[PDB]
Amino acid sequence: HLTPEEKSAVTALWGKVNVDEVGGEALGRLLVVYPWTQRFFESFGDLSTPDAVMGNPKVKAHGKKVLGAFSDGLAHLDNLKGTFATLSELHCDKLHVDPENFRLLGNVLVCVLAHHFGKEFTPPVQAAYQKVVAGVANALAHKYH
Amino acid sequence: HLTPEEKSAVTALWGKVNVDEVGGEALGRLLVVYPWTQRFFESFGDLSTPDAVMGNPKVKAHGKKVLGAFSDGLAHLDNLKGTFATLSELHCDKLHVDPENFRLLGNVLVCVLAHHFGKEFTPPVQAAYQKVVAGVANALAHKYH
Amino acid sequence: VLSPADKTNVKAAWGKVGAHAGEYGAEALERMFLSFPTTKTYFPHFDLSHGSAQVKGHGKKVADALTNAVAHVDDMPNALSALSDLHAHKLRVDPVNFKLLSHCLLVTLAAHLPAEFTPAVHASLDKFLASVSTVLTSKYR
Amino acid sequence: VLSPADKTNVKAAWGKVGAHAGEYGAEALERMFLSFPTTKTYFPHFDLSHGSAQVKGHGKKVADALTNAVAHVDDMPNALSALSDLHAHKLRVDPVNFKLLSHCLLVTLAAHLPAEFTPAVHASLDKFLASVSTVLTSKYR
Numbered sequence: 001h002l003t004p005e006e007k008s009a010v011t012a013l014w015g016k017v018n019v020d021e022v023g024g025e026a027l028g029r030l031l032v033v034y035p036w037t038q039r040f041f042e043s044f045g046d047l048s049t050p051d052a053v054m055g056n057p058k059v060k061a062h063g064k065k066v067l068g069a070f071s072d073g074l075a076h077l078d079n080l081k082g083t084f085a086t087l088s089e090l091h092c093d094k095l096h097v098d099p100e101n102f103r104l105l106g107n108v109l110v111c112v113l114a115h116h117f118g119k120e121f122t123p124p125v126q127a128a129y130q131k132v133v134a135g136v137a138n139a140l141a142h143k144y145h
Numbered sequence: 146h147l148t149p150e151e152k153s154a155v156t157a158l159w160g161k162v163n164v165d166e167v168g169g170e171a172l173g174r175l176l177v178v179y180p181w182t183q184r185f186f187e188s189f190g191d192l193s194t195p196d197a198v199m200g201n202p203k204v205k206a207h208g209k210k211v212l213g214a215f216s217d218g219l220a221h222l223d224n225l226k227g228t229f230a231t232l233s234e235l236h237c238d239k240l241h242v243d244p245e246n247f248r249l250l251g252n253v254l255v256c257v258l259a260h261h262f263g264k265e266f267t268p269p270v271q272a273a274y275q276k277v278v279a280g281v282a283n284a285l286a287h288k289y290h
Numbered sequence: 291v292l293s294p295a296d297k298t299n300v301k302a303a304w305g306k307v308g309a310h311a312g313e314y315g316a317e318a319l320e321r322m323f324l325s326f327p328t329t330k331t332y333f334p335h336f337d338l339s340h341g342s343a344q345v346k347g348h349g350k351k352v353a354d355a356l357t358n359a360v361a362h363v364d365d366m367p368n369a370l371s372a373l374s375d376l377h378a379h380k381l382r383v384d385p386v387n388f389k390l391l392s393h394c395l396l397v398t399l400a401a402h403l404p405a406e407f408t409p410a411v412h413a414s415l416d417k418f419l420a421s422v423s424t425v426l427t428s429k430y431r
Numbered sequence: 432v433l434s435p436a437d438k439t440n441v442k443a444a445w446g447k448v449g450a451h452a453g454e455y456g457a458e459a460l461e462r463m464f465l466s467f468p469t470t471k472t473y474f475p476h477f478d479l480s481h482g483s484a485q486v487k488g489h490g491k492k493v494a495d496a497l498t499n500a501v502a503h504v505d506d507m508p509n510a511l512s513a514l515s516d517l518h519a520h521k522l523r524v525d526p527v528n529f530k531l532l533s534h535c536l537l538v539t540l541a542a543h544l545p546a547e548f549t550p551a552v553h554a555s556l557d558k559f560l561a562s563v564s565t566v567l568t569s570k571y572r
C-alpha cells in the first residue's frame with residue numbers, strides 16, 4: 001500500500017491537476033493507443049483518426065466525468081473499495097466493461113501525468129501513482145461477478 | 146474468496162491427491178511447458194528433453210518439497226499470507242524468483258489435477274482451485290520488496 | 291513458432307478429440323465463465339447457465355475454428371484471416387482474455403485425454419493455442 | 432504490424448532523444464525498479480540505488496539496442512537476432528516484465544518530449560516497443 005510520504009506525494013501533485021483536461025486527454029489516448037476500446041463508445045461519433053478522437057467533444061466530456069470520479073477517489077485513498085463500490089456494480093451489470101480496461105486507462109493516465117508535469121513526475125512519484133491506478137482499477141473490479 | 150462450499154470441494158478433492166507424485170509432475174511440466182523457468186535449476190543437471198526433465202530425480206525431489214508446502218497452505222486457507230510469509234521472504238531475498246513464476250506453476254498444477262482426476266475435476270471444482278492457486282501465488286509474492 | 295513435433299502433437303491430440311470438439315469447446319467456455327467471471331462481460335445477453343444451448347452452439351463455433359487451424363497448421367494467419375478481421379474490428383475482446391480461454395481449453399483437453407496429454411503434448415498445445423491467439427489479435431492496431 | 436507512419440513517428444521521436452538515449456534508458460530502468468519491485472529479482476547482483484553506475488551503464492546498453500532496432504525497423508527479427516538468442520537462452524526474463532519496461536520507457540519519453548509525445552506518436556511508440564518485446568521473446572520455446 002501507500003506509505004504516508006507517498007500519499008502526500010500523490011495529493012500534492014493532484015492538487016495541481018486540471019482534471020477536466022487530463023481526463024479528456026487520458027480517455028482520448030486510450031482510444032487512439034488501444035483502438036479496440038472504442039467498442040464501448042460507438043455512439044460518440046467520429047473516431048476515425050487520432051485528431052477526430054482527441055477533438056471529439058463527446059470523448060472530452062466523458063473523459064472529464066470519469067477522471068472527476070477518479071479525482072474524488074483520491075480523497076479516500078484508505079477506502080478505494082467502498083468509494084467505487086457503486087461504479088463497480090454499474091460497469092459490470094450495466095456497462096459490461098472488462099476490468100482489464102481500467103488498467104489500460106490507468107497506464108495511459110500515468111503517461112499523461114508524465115507528459116504534463118515533465119521532470120516533476122519523478123520515479124518515486126510515478127511509483128506512488130502506479131499504486132493508485134492499480135488500487136482504483138482493483139476497486140472498480142471488486143463488485144464484478 | 147472461497148465460499149464454505151468451495152473450501153469443502155477443495156479439501157475433498159485434495160484428500161485423494163498423492164502430494165509427492167503431483168509435486169514432481171507439476172514442477173516437471175513447468176520446466177517442459179515454460180522452458181525458461183529452468184533458469185532457476187542450473188544445478189539440477191540434465192533438463193534437455195521432456196523425459197530428461199520429468200524423470201530428473203532432483204526435479205522429482207524438489208516437487209515433493211514444493212507441493213508439500215502447498216499442501217500445508219491448504220490447511221490454512223484463511224491465512225495464506227502468514228502461512229507463506231517466510232517462504233515468500235526466501236524466494237525474494239535468497240532465491241530471486243520472479244513472483245510471476247508462482248502463477249505459472251499454479252496453472253500447470255490445475256492442468257495436472259485435471260489430467261489426473263478427469264471428469265471429477267468439474268468446472269466448479271476448477272474455479273475453486275483457481276482461487277486457491279491465485280491466493281497461494283499472492284501469498285508467496287507478498288513479502289517481495 | 292511451431293516445430294515439426296508441435297504440429298505432430300497437436301494433430302494427434304485434436305484428432306483424438308475428433309467428434310467431441312464442439313462439446314469440449316462448450317466445456318472450455320463454461321470453465322472460463324466460472325473461473326474468470328470477467329470474461330462474461332463479452333457475453334452480456336447469452337444464457338450462460340449450465341448446459342444452455344447458446345453456450346453449446348458457441349462451443350461448436352470455437353471448436354470448428356480451432357479444427358480449421360489444425361487442418362491448416364502451416365498457413366494459420368491466412369486460414370484464420372476472416373476470423374481475425376472479426377476479432378479486431380468487431381468483437382475487440384481484450385488480449386488478456388485469450389490466455390484465459392486457452393488455459394481453460396488445456397484443462398478440458400487434460401480432463402478428456404488421459405493417454406495423450408503428455409508433458410510434450412501439453413507444451414505443443416499451449417504453443418498452438420498461443421499462436422492462434424496471436425493471429426486473432428494481430429490486426430488490433 | 433508497424434505501418435510506414437509508425438516507423439516515421441518512431442524514427443523522429445527516438446531521433447529527438449539523440450544523445451540522451453543512455454540517460455533515458457537508465458531512467459526507464461529506475462522507474463521500473465521503483466514502480467514494479469518484482470523486476471528487481473532479475474538484477475540481484477546489481478547496485479540499484481539512485482544514480483547507480485551499474486544502472487547508468489545498463490541504461491546505455493538498452494538504449495543502444497533500441498537505437499539499433501529503430502534503424503532496422505524494417506527487419507528487426509534479424510537486426511536483433513543475437514539479442515533474442517540471449518534473452519531466450521540465458522536471461523530468460525518472464526514475458527510479463529517486457530510490458531513493464533515498455534510502459535516505463537513510454538513514461539520516460541513522455542516526461543522528456545512534451546512536443547513530440549503526441550497521441551499518434553504515443554501509439555506508434557507503444558506498438559514499436561510491443562514489437563521489440565515480441566521479437567525478444569520469439570525464441571523462448
Ligand code: HEM
Binds near residue numbers: 041066067070102136
Ligand atoms: C478510471 C476508471 C474509471 C472510472 C472512475 C469510471 C467512471 C465512470 C463514471 C463516473 C461514469 C458515469 C456513470 C453514470 O452515468 O452514472 C462512467 C460511464 C461509463 N464508463 Fe467508466 N470509468 C472508468 C473507466 C472506464 C473505462 C476504461 C471504460 C472503457 C474503455 C469505461 C466505460 C464506460 C462507459 C461505456 C460509460 C457510459 C458511457 C455512456 O453513457 O455513453 N469506463 N464511467
Ligand code: HEM
Binds near residue numbers: 210242246281
Ligand atoms: C506453489 C509455489 C511454490 C511453493 C509452495 C514453493 C516451496 C518451496 C520450498 C518449501 C522450498 C525449499 C526451502 C528451502 O530450501 O529452504 C523451495 C525452494 C526453491 N524454490 Fe520454490 N516454491 C514454489 C514455487 C516456485 C517456483 C515456480 C520456482 C521457480 C520456477 C521456485 C524456485 C525455487 C528454487 C530455485 C528453490 C531452491 C531449490 C534448491 O536449489 O534447493 N519455487 N520452494
Ligand code: HEM
Binds near residue numbers: 329373
Ligand atoms: C482460441 C480463441 C478463440 C477462437 C478460435 C474464437 C472463435 C470464435 C468464432 C469462430 C466466433 C464466431 C464469429 C462469427 O461466427 O461471426 C467467435 C465469436 C465471439 N467470440 Fe470467440 N474465439 C476465441 C476467443 C475468444 C475470447 C477470449 C473471448 C472473450 C472472453 C471471445 C468472445 C467472443 C464473442 C463475444 C463472440 C461473438 C458472440 C456473439 O454472437 O454475440 N472469443 N469466436
Ligand code: HEM
Binds near residue numbers: 492497567
Ligand atoms: C526493450 C526491452 C529490452 C531490451 C531492448 C533489452 C536490452 C538488453 C541488452 C542490450 C542487454 C545487454 C546484453 C549484452 O551484454 O550483450 C540486456 C541484458 C539484460 N536484461 Fe534487458 N532488455 C530488455 C528487457 C528486459 C527486461 C524486461 C528485463 C527484466 C525486467 C531485462 C533484464 C536483463 C538482464 C538481467 C540482463 C543482464 C544484466 C546483467 O547481469 O548484466 N531486460 N538487456
Ligand SMILES: Cc1cc(C)cc(NC(=O)Cc2ccc(OC(C)(C)C(=O)OCCO[N+](=O)[O-])cc2)c1
Binds near residue numbers: 432534562563565566
Ligand atoms: C500487465 C501490463 C502492465 C503494464 C505496465 C502495461 C500493460 N499494457 C500493455 O501490455 C498494453 C497492450 C499492448 C498490446 C496488446 O495487444 C495487441 C494489440 C494484440 C498487440 O498487438 O500486442 C502484441 C504485440 O506483439 N507484436 O509486436 O507482434 C494488449 C495490451 C500491461
Ligand SMILES: Cc1cc(C)cc(NC(=O)Cc2ccc(OC(C)(C)C(=O)O)cc2)c1
Binds near residue numbers: 252569571
Ligand atoms: C489462466 C491464465 C491467466 C494468465 C494471466 C496467464 C496464463 N498463462 C500464460 O500466459 C501462459 C503463457 C503463454 C505464453 C508465454 O510466453 C511466450 C513468450 C512463449 C509467448 O508469448 O508465446 C508465457 C506464458 C493463464
Ligand SMILES: C[As](C)(=O)[O-]
Ligand atoms: C490484497 As486484499 C487484503 O485487499 O484482498
